[PDB]
Swiss-Prot record:
Gene behind this protein: DCLRE1A
UniProt main location, coarse: nucleus
Domain of life from the UniProt record: Eukaryota
Family: Belongs to the DNA repair metallo-beta-lactamase (DRMBL) family.
One GO-annotated biological process of the protein: double-strand break repair via nonhomologous end joining
Protein name per its UniProtKB record: DNA cross-link repair 1A protein
From-to range in the entire protein, with total length: 700 to 1040 of 1040
Signal sequence segment: none
Length: 341
């Protein structure tokens, strides 16, 4: 059964609620982004209206084979009417096609559902700035002060410089980047750009990337592995055994692998600066874990909420334990007392 925090009161609407069968009273199913924990349940047999971004709609049609007549893409930053209720989709600064949803209830209440997001000051100048929000359904993934990580720009700087140095020292080194979902495309695209190569990948991954409206993409990606010196592999293969095996398959073209695992947070963040990050090495293989996040750090989240000043917060992540829930509620109260709302 559908949990309360995926339901929008006063509407026929649910958010990211496709794994519960037919939800009683739901007239429209919203999907914030194309990640499996959120789309779980969608397929070509779905016959209710799905509301989403253009990019998410490309992925629904091409990857899950949802029929076109049930896909309802909306433009961002535009007031739209859905079953008699005004809604707006806003960029969530998560993965490609990921949105926040603003709902203007018939009784005058305004609700923001962040979906998954990485809070940014740029959000303080969207259509959020123009009215009060009463209720916030918040992505609380990293809602604790231990969760710090660097900007995406610093992380990409580190990766570009690391890769360019290694390959200039050894033109027979291969760079490998791990992936298991959409998101974090800048890692592998930035590295390929500094090295003057395309990124090589499976046909299934190339198909996924072709749904994303990224400019000039036919110029940056390929299925021809033999012509590429940046390869994408499943995240599960980014270990010494999986990489030794891959290196065999390249037929003596290469004699070294430098690999990258974009994680979210790991506890090496509580001690070490990005400048100071070192790989794990075995023989001719090195693996770097880089803290490239597409969710808010604690400080980013706090700033957003203290700016927005919602009347009520409903967490959507880490809700399954009493200790988590109690922790989060204590931070929410601190933020409110420090800011004065
Ligand atoms: Ni996500």
């Amino acid at each position: 059964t559908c949990p309360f925090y995926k339901k929008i009161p006063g509407t026929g609407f649910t958010v990211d609620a496709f794994q519960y069968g037919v939800v009683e009273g739901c007239t429209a199913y919203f999907l914030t982004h194309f990640h499996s924990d959120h789309y779980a349940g969608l397929s070509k047999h779905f016959t209710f209206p799905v509301y989403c971004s253009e990019i998410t709609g490309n992925l629904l049609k091409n990857k899950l084979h949802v029929q076109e007549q049930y896909i309802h893409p909306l433009p961002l930053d535009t007031e739209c009417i859905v079953n008699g209720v005004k809604v707006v989709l806003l960029d969530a600064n998560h993965c490609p096609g990921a949105v926040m949803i603003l709902f203007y209830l018939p009784n005058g209440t305004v609700i923001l559902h962040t979906g998954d997001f990485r809070a940014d000051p740029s959000m303080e100048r969207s259509l959020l700035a123009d009215q009060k929000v009463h209720m916030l359904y918040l992505d609380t993934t990293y809602c604790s002060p231990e969760y710090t990580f660097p900007s995406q720009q610093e992380v990409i700087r580190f990766a570009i410089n690391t890769a360019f140095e290694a390959v200039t020292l050894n033109p027979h080194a291969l760079v490998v980047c791990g992936t298991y979902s959409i998101g974090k495309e800048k890692v592998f695209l930035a590295i390929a750009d500094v090295l003057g190569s395309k990124v090589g990948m499976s046909q299934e991954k190339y198909k996924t990337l072709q749904c994303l409206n990224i400019p000039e993409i036919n110029s940056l990606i390929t299925t021809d592995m033999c012509s590429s010196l940046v390869h994408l592999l499943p995240m599960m293969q980014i270990n010494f055994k999986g990489l030794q095996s891959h290196l065999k398959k390249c037929g003596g073209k290469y004699n070294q692998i430098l690999a990258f695992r974009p994680t979210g947070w790991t506890h090496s963040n509580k001690f070490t600066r990005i400048a100071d990050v070192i790989p794990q090495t075995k023989g001719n293989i090195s693996i770097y874990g880089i803290p490239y996040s597409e969710h808010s750090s604690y400080l980013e989240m706090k700033r957003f909420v203290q700016w927005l000043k919602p009347q009520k917060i409903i967490p959507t992540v880490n809700v399954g334990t009493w200790k988590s829930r109690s922790t989060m509620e204590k931070y929410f109260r601190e933020w409110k007392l420090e800011a004065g709302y």
